[PDB]
Amino acid sequence: SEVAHRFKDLGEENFKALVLIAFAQYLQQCPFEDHVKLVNEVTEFAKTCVADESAENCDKSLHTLFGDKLCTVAADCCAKQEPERNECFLQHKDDNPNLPRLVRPEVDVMCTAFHDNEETFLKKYLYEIARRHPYFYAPELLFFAKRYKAAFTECCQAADKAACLLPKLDELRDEGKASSAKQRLKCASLQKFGERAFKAWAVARLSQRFPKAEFAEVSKLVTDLTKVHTECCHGDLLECADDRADLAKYICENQDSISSKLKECCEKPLLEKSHCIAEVENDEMPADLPSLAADFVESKDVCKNYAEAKDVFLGMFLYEYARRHPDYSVVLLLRLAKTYETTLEKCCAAADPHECYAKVFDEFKPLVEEPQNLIKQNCELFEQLGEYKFQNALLVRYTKKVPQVSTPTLVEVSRNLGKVGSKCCKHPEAKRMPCAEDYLSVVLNQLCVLHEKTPVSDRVTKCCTESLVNRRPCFSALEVDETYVPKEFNAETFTFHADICTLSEKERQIKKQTALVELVKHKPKATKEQLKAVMDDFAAFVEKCCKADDKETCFAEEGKKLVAASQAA
Ligand SMILES: CC[C@@H](Cc1c(I)cc(I)c(O)c1I)C(=O)O
Ligand SMILES: CC[C@@H](Cc1c(I)cc(I)c(O)c1I)C(=O)O
Ligand SMILES: CC[C@@H](Cc1c(I)cc(I)c(O)c1I)C(=O)O
Ligand SMILES: CC[C@@H](Cc1c(I)cc(I)c(O)c1I)C(=O)O
């Protein structure tokens, strides 16, 4: 009885939550009520399996159980059986579900609902989250749930609940969206590029983090993590949550053989412990570490070792190069690994290989500097314009690259691409590349998945498909789509109403940004100057209507003066 196994290990709480998360991510459209029913129903059945391990169906598997459950409230997916049926659910996971933006009422009401029904209040949380992020790292979502409870606990007992809650909640929202995106990458990596890609990625990341840990150690960790994330990404949340616990235990047990900064983490409760490790800063770099050239360039036994065990040898190279380069991004370390392999392929087949792969590090030079210079450039640019103007530049640039992409997607992705400026440019050159280029891997992966649903640009498709590691370079190389035929103007697209006078300031900028995109799509050839020339005028167009009492008309009357000058430029 698998159900019993998981129940005993995780307890009633986590089990309940994890099961809720699972259902919400599968049937994101079904309402909260229908889900809680199914959860309790499954939980009650789970209990009759812990002691009575031979009760009917306790022998069955988690998919069969969960599947038969969901199919009682859904249609073609339920027409299938094992494997088939399950996978059918996974393929129908929506990354951009048409769901009503989650608004949160006055501080007073939420506290009443929380103090009144606390268990339901938190369940409602997981459900609304899990359904808008079908690939959320489940075990981590539990950690956030706790902090969510801890926020209301304190703040609902304060003089000014508002000034206490709102911040803690804004900070949770962000940290949550960031976590969701990091995970979504892990899943895309596994599903779209396979176990090898993810493993290589994990080895580089872990090598950097745990430069003192031996290769055999890192490799053992990578293998476990793969299992965990394979399970989480496929919906095996119970098995994931369990295995993740096992791993975190193993890591705190072998602290000495891994990292000297796990001390803090291993003293905390499970949830806090797991979250602590995944965020632990890199360990110190071992003192006297030999030059990489000795074993991977100068040695005359290279092509032999490469032939003997390619994947192990290259793995060793990556582990060895990453551990001594925390200043390099993970994707860069991989580019170097691909470049190294490719060279061995060529050279090991030649007459004198040793002098074929003699000047290999000279091939790295260009790959190392490209990121460095682009970083340096875009930071100084960012420093002179600020986050807002900087986002605009990216809006215009990326809209020129791939005009076919939907405006909502462009605005989101660009805005996110711009946040890299504030996140990373503050750091010293030493920690810049990891922060920057890896964060862009996540943002670009967002663009890819959202595109994958409804493809409209082969340039997005290409850059998204042919290499995970080269995604960013591939995109930077793009300039202007020359085959793109500009779209004509649509009245409804350039109609500024008074409703924009109640939106926040951010909500207003996002409307001024959504417009800029539509403009570029109409005149891609237009110049950065001519655009700013009208962009400035767009600000004036609205700094009037909302300031003309008792005239809803303004939106149209002034809108005429707007479009008029618009068609001009
Ligand atoms: C800004 C919307 C977020 C959802 C979200 C999250 I994640 C965590 C908390 I706390 C929230 O209040 C909210 I709203 C998203 O759609 O990514
Ligand atoms: C290397 C994988 C993760 C970090 C990580 C680690 I190290 C340990 C546990 I347990 C986790 O759940 C996670 I996520 C990353 O670097 O993105
Ligand atoms: C480095 C120059 C910018 C160009 C640019 C563009 I295109 C549109 C607007 I509006 C701008 O303010 C700017 I500066 C870029 O290519 O990233
Ligand atoms: C040319 C810059 C790259 C992306 C990039 C990089 I690399 C570093 C920083 I700092 C950024 O803000 C950004 I945007 C691109 O847009 O193609």
Swiss-Prot record:
In-chain residues carrying the UniProt-annotated modification Phosphoserine: 1, 54, 61, 260, 406, 476
Glycosylation sites: 8, 47, 124, 149, 186, 212, 220, 263, 268, 300, 304-305, 310, 338, 365, 400, 426, 431, 481, 512, 521, 523, 532, 560
GO molecular function: antioxidant activity; copper ion binding; DNA binding; enterobactin binding; exogenous protein binding; fatty acid binding; identical protein binding; protein-folding chaperone binding
Record note on what altering residue 164 to F does: In Hawkes bay
Tissues and organs where the protein is expressed, per its UniProt entry: Plasma.
UniProt GO BP: cellular response to calcium ion starvation; cellular response to starvation; negative regulation of mitochondrial depolarization
Function in brief: Binds water, Ca(2+), Na(+), K(+), fatty acids, hormones, bilirubin and drugs. Its main function is the regulation of the colloidal osmotic pressure of blood. Major zinc transporter in plasma, typically binds about 80% of all plasma zinc. Major calcium and magnesium transporter in plasma, binds approximately 45% of circulating calcium and magnesium in plasma. Potentially has more than two calcium-binding sites and might additionally bind calcium in a non-specific manner.
PANTHER family given in the database record: ALBUMIN (PTHR11385:SF15), SERUM ALBUMIN-RELATED (PTHR11385)
Protein's UniProt name: Albumin
Lineage of producing organism: Eukaryota, Metazoa, Chordata, Craniata, Vertebrata
